[PDB]
Structures are given as structure tokens and as C-alpha cells.
Amino acid sequence: IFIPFRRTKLTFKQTDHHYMCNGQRKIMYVIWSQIHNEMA
């Protein structure tokens, strides 16, 4: 999901991740967005 602002040109991406509920493994999407440009 690509959203432009006056300053930034942000992008919202997603990946998968695992977590245990009631002892059983479950998979959910984690939505991330790099915002600190110096991170790259």
C-alpha cells in the first residue's frame, strides 16, 4: 500500500509470522513499513 505525503513516499508491506495460541501454532500477517531512510 503506497501512500505519498508532502515529505515522505511511504510504502506499507507485509510478511508472515508465527505465534502459539492455546498450544497450537498459528500464522498471521505482520504489516511493516520502513520510515527511517538511513536504515538502508
Is residue 26 part of the contact set for other proteins (CB under 8 A)? yes
Is residue 11 part of the contact set for other proteins (CB under 8 A)? no
- Total binding residues toward other proteins, as defined by CB under 8 A: 12
Burial track 3-22 (b if 16+ CB lie within 10 A, e otherwise): eeeeeeeeeeeeeeeeeeee
Amino acid at 29: Y
Is residue 25 part of the contact set for other proteins (CB under 8 A)? yes
CA dist 2 and 11 (Å) reads 4
Is residue 32 part of the contact set for other proteins (CB under 8 A)? no
Binding site for other proteins (CB under 8 A): 1, 3, 12-14, 16, 18, 25-27, 29, 31
